[PDB]
Design goal:
Chain B: This is Hint domain-containing protein. This is part of a larger assembly, with 1 copy of chain A (122 residues), 2 copies of chain B and 1 copy of chain C (221 residues). Chain B is mainly alpha-helical and 49 residues long. Chain B has 1 helix and no strands. In chain C, a hairpin with a 4-residue loop joins strand 1 and strand 2. The chains are: A mainly beta (122), B mainly alpha (49), C mainly beta (221). The interface between A and C is medium-sized, with 19 and 34 residues.
């Protein structure tokens, strides 16, 4: 294969099989990791393996990952802007403050079973 | 592990108490001022009369 | 390319380029203050078929940063690519910049090919064993296994395979402090990379072409 | 019958898991009854805590936050008792402030 960077998340095929989450394109500065004292941005859902963490390597950064039936996010040392989508195809944006916890639809104000569309680092 | 989770719940409870105590302190000062003002108003009224 | 980080002024003639916003990215190196040499496949619609990479303006806005060993600092120069001059036979393209960078010297070109057993080095901005995108550029070590028709076959020494984002990156051979460009990385097995696995560390690079560069860089004397 | 009973009483997690169990095989039904229903209940509990963390008052918010980052046992104790204490604290605050 050609050694060309296509910005497609490395190992995404394996992750889909292992954690149940799927990943697409990003600017390469966010990696999926374990949740064991190394937590940075943490995503909770009721599917796959329940949760997983991401590590920010540099700012700004983003990764358009998809996580079905997401309901909560933890932030750390940084504001996180999050895009989620409803079952009717309508998308909205939630501003999560640093070092705090926020929720989505199901654990938010609407109760909707929303999906995580984009995770962006300020 | 358990003593740390228990510690957190006590710390949270203390924060609540501290905030309520703060307000009571303010309430006491307000009432004290209201009583002083009433006293002064009474003396002013006594002077007027 | 998996090895120690390096920011020393021995390999400050290297460059990193991005095509579009998030379309394609790869490595390169200076041959002049106005010219940067990289792979043609970086500008192809189909990376495995660099036949349609015609001469002229880039299909998408392309920018390059030169000498910026560490991406978290402002050190280095930023230039836009205005014209491309593809090699008539192999996967190699010369990128013309809008403005020169007179502060950073180019790398000298090799007079001939390395032979099997020759110790080569390589530097680039591609993936590492544990990072999708690095902060600093890294230098690895490779050996020549064979030489073929206009290309050189190499393998990683003690691991250290050519991975991804290394396309267009230089292959170097030094002697007595002088560095010569012997080829340009095109394809690799990508073993020992973040997010993937394979045993092989083999890679292939286009052979450096001094005449191609000379008749392009000095085309308008 | 037992699985059907759990669907009617449980939350979204229990309901989805139980629903699948009923339409599956005998072995799948046994697995749900033996362990699956407990896993499902824990997920329902976690979400309820997460909701309180965002929709409740100051004390309910903070208490839910602590339980949410703890063990399943901490989340259950919070939902059964702790959130009620937290409410009472929010009510006290509002009353005193008034």
């Amino acid at each position: 294969p050609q050694a060309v960077e296509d910005f497609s998340y490395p190992g995404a095929a394996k992750i889909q099989a292992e954690t149940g989450a799927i990943l697409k394109r990003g600017n390469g500065h966010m990696l999926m990791t374990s949740c064991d004292g190394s937590e940075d941005i943490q995503v909770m859902s009721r599917t796959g393996q329940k949760d997983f963490c991401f590590n920010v390597m540099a700012k700004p950064a983003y990764l358009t990952l998809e996580v079905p039936q997401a309901y909560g996010i933890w932030t750390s040392a940084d504001p996180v802007k999050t895009t989620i989508k409803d079952t009717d195809g309508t998308a909205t944006v939630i501003n999560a403050p640093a070092n705090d916890f926020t929720g989505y639809g199901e654990a938010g104000s609407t109760g909707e079973p929303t999906t995580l569309i984009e995770l962006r680092v300020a | 592990t358990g003593q740390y989770m228990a510690k957190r719940k006590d710390d949270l409870a203390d924060v609540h108490v501290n905030q309520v105590e703060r307000l009571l302190a303010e309430g006491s000062l307000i009432a004290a001022e209201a009583n002083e003002d009433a006293w002064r108003a009474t003396e002013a009224a006594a002077t007027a009369e | 390319t998996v090895g120690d980080p390096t920011t020393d002024a021995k390999l400050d003639f290297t460059a990193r380029l991005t095509i579009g916003t998030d379309y394609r990215s790869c490595s390169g190196a200076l041959v002049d203050t106005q010219w940067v040499l990289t792979a043609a496949s970086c500008f192809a619609d189909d990376p495995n078929q660099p036949d349609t990479v015609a001469a002229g303006k880039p299909a998408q806005l392309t920018r390059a940063t030169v000498g910026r060993a560490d991406s978290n600092i402002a050190n280095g120069y930023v230039r836009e690519v205005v014209e491309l001059v593809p090699h008539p036979e192999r996967d190699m393209v010369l990128a013309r910049l809008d403005k020169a960078i007179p502060d950073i010297a180019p790398v000298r070109l090799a007079s001939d090919a390395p032979t099997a057993g020759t110790p080569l080095t390589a530097v680039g901005f591609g993936r590492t064993k544990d990072e999708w995108v690095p902060i600093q550029r890294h230098q690895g070590a490779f050996t020549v296994t064979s030489v073929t028709a206009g290309a050189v076959n190499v393998t990683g020494q003690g691991g250290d395979a050519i991975c991804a984002g290394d396309t267009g990156g230089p292959l170097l051979q030094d002697k007595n402090g002088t560095l010569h460009l012997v080829g340009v990385n095109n394809r690799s097995m990508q073993g020992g990379c973040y997010g993937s696995e394979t045993t092989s560390t083999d890679a292939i690079a286009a052979m450096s072409d001094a005449d191609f560069v000379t008749q392009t860089v000095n085309r308008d004397l | 019958v037992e699985i059907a009973r759990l669907i009617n009483l449980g939350g979204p997690g229990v309901r989805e898991a139980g629903k699948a169990a009923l339409q599956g095989t005998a072995e799948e039904r046994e697995l749900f009854l033996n362990s699956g229903q407990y896993t499902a209940q824990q997920d329902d509990n976690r979400v309820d805590v997460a909701r309180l963390a965002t929709t409740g008052g100051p004390n309910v918010q903070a208490a839910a936050k602590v339980a949410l980052r703890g063990t399943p046992e901490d989340m259950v104790e919070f939902l059964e008792v702790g959130q009620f204490t937290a409410r009472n604290r929010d009510q006290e605050h509002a009353t005193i402030a008034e």
